[PDB]
Amino acid sequence: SPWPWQVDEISFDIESLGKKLKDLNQACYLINLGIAQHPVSAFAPALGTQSLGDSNFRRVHGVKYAYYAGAMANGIASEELVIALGQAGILCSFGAAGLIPSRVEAAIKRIQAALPNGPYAFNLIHSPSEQALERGSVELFLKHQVRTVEASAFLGLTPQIVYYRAAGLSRDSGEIVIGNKVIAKISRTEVATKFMEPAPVKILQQLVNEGLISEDQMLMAQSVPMADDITAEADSGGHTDNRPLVTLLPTILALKDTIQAKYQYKTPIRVGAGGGIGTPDAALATFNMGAAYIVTGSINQACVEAGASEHTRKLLATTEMADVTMAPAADMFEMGVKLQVVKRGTLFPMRANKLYEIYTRYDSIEIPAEERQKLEEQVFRASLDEIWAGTVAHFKQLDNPKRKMALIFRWYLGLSSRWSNTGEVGREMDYQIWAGPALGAFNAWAKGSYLDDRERNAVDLAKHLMQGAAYQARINLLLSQGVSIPVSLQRWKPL
Amino acid sequence: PWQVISFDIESLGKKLKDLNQACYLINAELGIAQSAEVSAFAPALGTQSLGDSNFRRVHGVKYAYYAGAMANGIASEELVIALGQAGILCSFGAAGLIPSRVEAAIKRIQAALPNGPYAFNLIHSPSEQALERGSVELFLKHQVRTVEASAFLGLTPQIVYYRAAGLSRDASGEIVIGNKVIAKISRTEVATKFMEPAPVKILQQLVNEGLISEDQMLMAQSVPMADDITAEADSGGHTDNRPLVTLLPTILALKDTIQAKYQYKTPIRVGAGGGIGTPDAALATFNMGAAYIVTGSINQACVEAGASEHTRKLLATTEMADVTMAPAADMFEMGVKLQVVKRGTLFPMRANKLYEIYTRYDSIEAIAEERQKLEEQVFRASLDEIWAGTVAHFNERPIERALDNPKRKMALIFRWYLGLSSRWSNTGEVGREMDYQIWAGPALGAFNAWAKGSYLDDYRERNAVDLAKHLMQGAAYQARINLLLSQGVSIPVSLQRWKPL
Numbered sequence A: 001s002p003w004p005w006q007v008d009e010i011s012f013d014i015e016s017l018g019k020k021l022k023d024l025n026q027a028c029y030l031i032n033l034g035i036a037q038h039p040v041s042a043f044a045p046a047l048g049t050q051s052l053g054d055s056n057f058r059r060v061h062g063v064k065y066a067y068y069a070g071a072m073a074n075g076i077a078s079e080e081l082v083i084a085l086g087q088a089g090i091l092c093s094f095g096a097a098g099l100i101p102s103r104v105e106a107a108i109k110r111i112q113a114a115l116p117n118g119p120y121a122f123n124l125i126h127s128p129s130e131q132a133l134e135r136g137s138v139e140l141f142l143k144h145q146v147r148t149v150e151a152s153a154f155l156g157l158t159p160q161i162v163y164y165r166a167a168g169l170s171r172d173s174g175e176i177v178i179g180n181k182v183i184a185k186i187s188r189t190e191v192a193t194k195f196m197e198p199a200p201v202k203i204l205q206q207l208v209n210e211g212l213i214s215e216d217q218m219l220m221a222q223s224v225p226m227a228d229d230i231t232a233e234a235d236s237g238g239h240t241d242n243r244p245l246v247t248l249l250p251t252i253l254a255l256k257d258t259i260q261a262k263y264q265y266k267t268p269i270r271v272g273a274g275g276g277i278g279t280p281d282a283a284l285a286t287f288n289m290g291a292a293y294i295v296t297g298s299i300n301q302a303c304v305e306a307g308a309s310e311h312t313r314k315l316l317a318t319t320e321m322a323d324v325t326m327a328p329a330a331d332m333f334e335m336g337v338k339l340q341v342v343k344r345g346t347l348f349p350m351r352a353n354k355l356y357e358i359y360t361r362y363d364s365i366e367i368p369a370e371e372r373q374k375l376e377e378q379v380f381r382a383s384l385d386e387i388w389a390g391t392v393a394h395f396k397q398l399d400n401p402k403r404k405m406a407l408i409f410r411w412y413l414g415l416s417s418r419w420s421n422t423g424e425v426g427r428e429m430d431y432q433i434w435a436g437p438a439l440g441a442f443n444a445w446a447k448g449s450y451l452d453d454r455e456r457n458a459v460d461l462a463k464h465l466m467q468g469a470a471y472q473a474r475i476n477l478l479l480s481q482g483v484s485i486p487v488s489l490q491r492w493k494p495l
Numbered sequence B: 001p002w003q004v005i006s007f008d009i010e011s012l013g014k015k016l017k018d019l020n021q022a023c024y025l026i027n028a029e030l031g032i033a034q035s036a037e038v039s040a041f042a043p044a045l046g047t048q049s050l051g052d053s054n055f056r057r058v059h060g061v062k063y064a065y066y067a068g069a070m071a072n073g074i075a076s077e078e079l080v081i082a083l084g085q086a087g088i089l090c091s092f093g094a095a096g097l098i099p100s101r102v103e104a105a106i107k108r109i110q111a112a113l114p115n116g117p118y119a120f121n122l123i124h125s126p127s128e129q130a131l132e133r134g135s136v137e138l139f140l141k142h143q144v145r146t147v148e149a150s151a152f153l154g155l156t157p158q159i160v161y162y163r164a165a166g167l168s169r170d171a172s173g174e175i176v177i178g179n180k181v182i183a184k185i186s187r188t189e190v191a192t193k194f195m196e197p198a199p200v201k202i203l204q205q206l207v208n209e210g211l212i213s214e215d216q217m218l219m220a221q222s223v224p225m226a227d228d229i230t231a232e233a234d235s236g237g238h239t240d241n242r243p244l245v246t247l248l249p250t251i252l253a254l255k256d257t258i259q260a261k262y263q264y265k266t267p268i269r270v271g272a273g274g275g276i277g278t279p280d281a282a283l284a285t286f287n288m289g290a291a292y293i294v295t296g297s298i299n300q301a302c303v304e305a306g307a308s309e310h311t312r313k314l315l316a317t318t319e320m321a322d323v324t325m326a327p328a329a330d331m332f333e334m335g336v337k338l339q340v341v342k343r344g345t346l347f348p349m350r351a352n353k354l355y356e357i358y359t360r361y362d363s364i365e366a367i368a369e370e371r372q373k374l375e376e377q378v379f380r381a382s383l384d385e386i387w388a389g390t391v392a393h394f395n396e397r398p399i400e401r402a403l404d405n406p407k408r409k410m411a412l413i414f415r416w417y418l419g420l421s422s423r424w425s426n427t428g429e430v431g432r433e434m435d436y437q438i439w440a441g442p443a444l445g446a447f448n449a450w451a452k453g454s455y456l457d458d459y460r461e462r463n464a465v466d467l468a469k470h471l472m473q474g475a476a477y478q479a480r481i482n483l484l485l486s487q488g489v490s491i492p493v494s495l496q497r498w499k500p501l
């Protein structure tokens, strides 16, 4: 046919054909039901996991895969998880969000002790109201030389994130060296533009004025982008817009090309993608869409290294595709913001949505007493007044009727995640567990495997998705050439 | 491995776009040649290499592609005949149409396409089994041998009847599937029922009513209820807003499980729709890997579609942010919602208001600061005027049940607006443009973005066959680019994507 080869009698056994196919190190010569490593009808080259993604991403972050495990709040993306993945040459971002500085600093030491030469990243979340908490974290990272952050939840540039970026700039031949790297996670084009563009001169100038950065650093900062890597986050667990991966990522890739042509950075900007990736199929499709790297995910909270209770991790292994839903978010409850949570084996969603329903419909906690009793009785397990007293002790504390109601309600929204993380007994039906459909897709893919179990390791999962993607790229390639592959061999299974 | 050409960017771009000829790439001074005795190589793989070849065989079509059904004849005879003439499968929008109308369509379409291809939408009527039975009867009578079954929550005697009746043996004793079913689903529970053989309880009853034979009942237990399973992700109209990248993989896994168990002679095929308006999305879905891809919101924007000029013109400016969820007419009381355009129309806002009022109040007595606004802006008549007229509509269907219940009366009045709103958009009813109900998903906005700065900016230049061609050709072209990129080659950014030139 199209091929310049011949072979002498190959292998004709399905379990010899299956084994040879899964070897991505050796090329495949297919003869019409025979595989070898007289004529040749189909051919598949030797393409491993390294043919997926942007090689520059791997080079720059010193990682073995174009893959990174996204941050998970309140230390769910824990030190154990980061160290486990870091030791395998896989990038993971530490879930610093919601943790106190002393806690985060502790993590920096452990992690840096375990991984002197990387790789790891730290999540730098945007605190729009508490601007100092953001400053403390940047200072903490600069002090301990944390040279990679995943910046997320940003709506615009802030002096702190610009400061972090600019401070890591230096010269070698006079070429610019980007010491501090930024992965900006976005779902909107407006925000992505600001991270693909050089830092604004106005903010730069201010930092030079305060002796935070040098003049040559201000000069350098105008010639390089704010972020090296841009993660388009599609529909996902926790906070999300629920945007489609297949529309979002292409929009951001186009945006990238536009800005790259304009500023013509020496090192190109890279766009990766996360959101809904729990199987090799999806992983491969995302790569072929143009993604430099792929991001997970809900599947990582289900692993043993994660900072989630045993009850929760066990529950996540049974969660299916339709077992997730949207529920009021604690921090942006009044504004109607929602996040994606598990709704199976937990009643938090129903109860949290009830609070929002009650909050929007009624003027004060002084609400029908038939309705009020149920809340105190089942949800809060205390008088609304008893709950209020404790909120005051925690804390914005009185003039407004609706604002008071919200603060009491937020007691449940806030705690509910803490219960799931720590494993608070007797509050299981109230666990707030963030997850997306990706987890259910993974559980479906993994059904009837060792992974049905305590047997779930983040490194193993990464390896499957990466190897699975590479294998299925080969299968697709062969199918495209009219070769008939046994249905049982077309997909990567965990076995 | 063969041995060492053109360097002209225009020649490189042109040669790359020829999927019929192989590509020999040399990196001096990249060089591309179509003859050899070689840094990178790309074989000749056209649109025929995407999808499941069996899907094309079985439906006698050029592409692993089908234009999904659009209700009330939006997927019109014109659209079906246009796509059928190009060897592309299209499903006729029978939903909501009266039998005499559907029969008319069968003739026109069968006259134009004696040997296919086409399909007819068989929608689930939970409320009235008579509408479903009449349609199955109509299809069996006129030998409509392909239906797209959608909106089903599980098996129904009618859909089982349709499937079983088309079963027969060849001289060799093998089972021949005469009537084909494409089941469109978004849940694993429902997909299982269509991937599994028909239940004997329902089968036996059909044998007892003389509808099918005993050997047909026997055959029906060794073949699946559907040949093709369309996983419908986030899409226009009715949807539960699921991600394509999680749903399709879940259904493919489910497929493999059931295939291993029953080991059908001809395997089940799982295809996918929902959010496909660009070559990028098309290729990703294939890569995932679907047997076929389905559209879509982009088809309602084409000239062949049964949508008003005002609507089609509006759809050419619709962006991804311009769609939202609104109460559905058929399932208004149950709180069901569907995805509609919210740009250039106030239907969504007004329809959501009706649901708010319906759930909060016991009867139209007593709503009247609110009541006046509805009468004033939405209905443009008194609620009483609307109630009458509705009485005339259902009297020559019974209304009798509504008198006993004020809640049922309120809903029936409200549904006057929910129902006619789509009719206005379809017909192009003047003076009610701000009330048009237009079903669409994010895929349309993605298409409009992809097509900007091209001849397709003009709605008048939008043809279903041309769109199908772009998505299929675009996907095939970009698969080649990916293949080359993976072979370590560097392709000019301007050539990496299929653009409608």
Ligand SMILES: NC(=O)c1ccc[n+]([C@@H]2O[C@H](COP(=O)([O-])OP(=O)(O)OC[C@H]3O[C@@H](n4cnc5c(N)ncnc54)[C@H](O)[C@@H]3O)[C@@H](O)[C@H]2O)c1
Pocket: A073, A074, A097, A098, A125, A237, A238, A239, A240, A330, A331, A390, A391, A394, A407, A410, A411, A413, A414, A415, A417, A434
């Ligand atoms: N997918 C994502 O991006 C994602 C997912 C989860 C969380 N996050 C972010 O990470 C962090 C998670 O932290 P969080 O929001 O769970 O905690 P938080 O501290 O941000 O919670 C804020 C709410 O907690 C309530 N609260 C907590 N403890 C209380 C107590 N003892 N008494 C009364 N009220 C109390 C407060 O009233 C407040 O309204 C946040 O920044 C969140 O925005 C992001």
Ligand SMILES: NC(=O)c1ccc[n+]([C@@H]2O[C@H](COP(=O)([O-])OP(=O)(O)OC[C@H]3O[C@@H](n4cnc5c(N)ncnc54)[C@H](O)[C@@H]3O)[C@@H](O)[C@H]2O)c1
Pocket: B071, B072, B095, B096, B123, B150, B151, B236, B237, B238, B239, B329, B330, B389, B390, B393, B412, B415, B416, B417, B418, B419, B420, B422, B439
């Ligand atoms: N994606 C999808 O699956 C999808 C999308 C759109 C529609 N559909 C299906 O298409 C079909 C189209 O039906 P539909 O929902 O447009 O309307 P319909 O024919 O189901 O009738 C809608 C309701 O509107 C009211 N109504 C309609 N016309 C009226 C009049 N002249 N006077 C008074 N009241 C009137 C009645 O209450 C009626 O029950 C439905 O079966 C729907 O389920 C499916």
Ligand SMILES: Cc1cc2nc3c(=O)[nH]c(=O)nc-3n(C[C@H](O)[C@H](O)[C@H](O)COP(=O)(O)O)c2cc1C
Pocket: A069, A070, A071, A072, A073, A074, A076, A095, A097, A123, A125, A151, A152, A153, A185, A233, A235, A236, A237, A238, A274, A275, A276, A277, A278, A295, A296, A297, A298, A299, A301, A433, A434, A435, A436, A437, A438
């Ligand atoms: C429990 C949980 C907590 C998360 N916390 C954060 C966070 O604090 N900051 C952040 O940027 N992303 C957070 N994410 C998002 C992930 O980093 C990643 O972007 C997303 O989960 C990928 O989509 P997927 O979950 O559908 O794979 C969280 C995700 C989950 C499931």
Ligand SMILES: Cc1cc2nc3c(=O)[nH]c(=O)nc-3n(C[C@H](O)[C@H](O)[C@H](O)COP(=O)(O)O)c2cc1C
Pocket: B067, B068, B069, B070, B071, B072, B074, B093, B095, B121, B123, B150, B151, B184, B232, B234, B235, B236, B237, B273, B274, B275, B276, B277, B294, B295, B296, B297, B298, B300, B438, B439, B440, B441, B442, B443
């Ligand atoms: C205006 C419109 C009407 C539709 N009507 C029907 C219908 O009556 N029956 C049906 O099964 N699907 C219907 N669909 C769904 C399509 O057949 C197709 O499955 C879906 O639009 C694909 O998703 P996409 O719009 O994101 O491409 C309709 C879609 C649109 C946009």
